[PDB]
């Protein structure tokens, strides 16, 4: 669970200061955690220890209730290397892997252990039309299936 899907591109000249702060989530391979869940953010902090406090927060409409969730993710290799190890409970699936990000850390891909966990997460609750071709176009050719995604609920959508 902490290593990789076979044959996925994980990010390899990571910077994890560049990637601290809050993340939206724009899509979601749905499982029991995050169903019916709205206004999805992570939030990433570094620590003394080398690894990275996440805290997942989303909010379920119908009870009118929020969710969170804290967890620890520590590199498997190099902090180069966007490969992390995460707890297994709530939205966390052992296995945490940045298989896309552009340039300026503002969009990315992660990945969980196999090709069932798969997220679409922005600094910005929208993304453009535009982004969102790009993001499918590189988990199909790393064999995900898009079909799965879930366009979460998110101010201005």
Same mark, same amino acid.
């Not at 966390?92 to 552009?102: K, P, Q």
């Not at 929208?126 to 199909?140: G, W």
């Given at each position: 669970?902490?290593?990789?899907?076979?044959?996925?591109?994980?990010?390899?000249?990571?910077?994890?200061?560049?990637?601290?702060?809050?993340?939206?989530?724009?899509?979601?391979?749905?499982?029991?955690?995050?169903?019916?869940?709205?206004?999805?953010?992570?939030?990433?902090?570094?620590?003394?220890?080398?690894?990275?406090?996440?805290?997942?927060?989303?909010?379920?409409?119908?009870?009118?209730?929020? !969710?969170?969730?804290?967890?620890? +993710?520590?590199?498997? #290799?190099?902090?180069?290397?966007?490969?992390?190890? &995460?707890?297994?409970? $709530?939205?966390?699936?052992?296995?945490?892997?940045?298989?896309?990000?552009?340039?300026?850390?503002?969009?990315?891909?992660?990945?969980?252990?196999?090709?069932?966990?798969?997220?679409?997460?922005?600094?910005?609750?929208?993304?453009?039309?535009?982004?969102? !071709?790009?993001?499918?176009?590189? +988990?199909?050719?790393? #064999?995900?299936?898009?079909?799965?995604?879930?366009? &979460?609920?998110?101010? $201005?959508?």
């Amino acid at each position: 669970s902490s290593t990789p899907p076979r044959g996925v591109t994980v990010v390899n000249n990571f910077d994890c200061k560049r990637y601290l702060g809050t993340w939206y989530e724009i899509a979601r391979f749905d499982h029991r955690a995050e169903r019916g869940l709205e206004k999805v953010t992570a939030t990433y902090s570094l620590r003394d220890d080398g690894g990275l406090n996440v805290i997942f927060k989303g909010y379920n409409p119908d009870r009118g209730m929020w !969710q969170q969730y804290v967890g620890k +993710a520590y590199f498997t #290799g190099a902090p180069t290397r966007a490969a992390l190890k &995460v707890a297994f409970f $709530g939205p966390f699936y052992g296995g945490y892997n940045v298989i896309a990000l552009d340039r300026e850390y503002r969009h990315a891909l992660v990945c969980g252990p196999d090709r069932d966990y798969l997220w679409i997460n922005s600094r910005t609750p929208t993304i453009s039309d535009e982004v969102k !071709q790009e993001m499918l176009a590189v +988990a199909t050719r790393e #064999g995900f299936d898009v079909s799965k995604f879930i366009w &979460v609920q998110q101010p $201005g959508s």
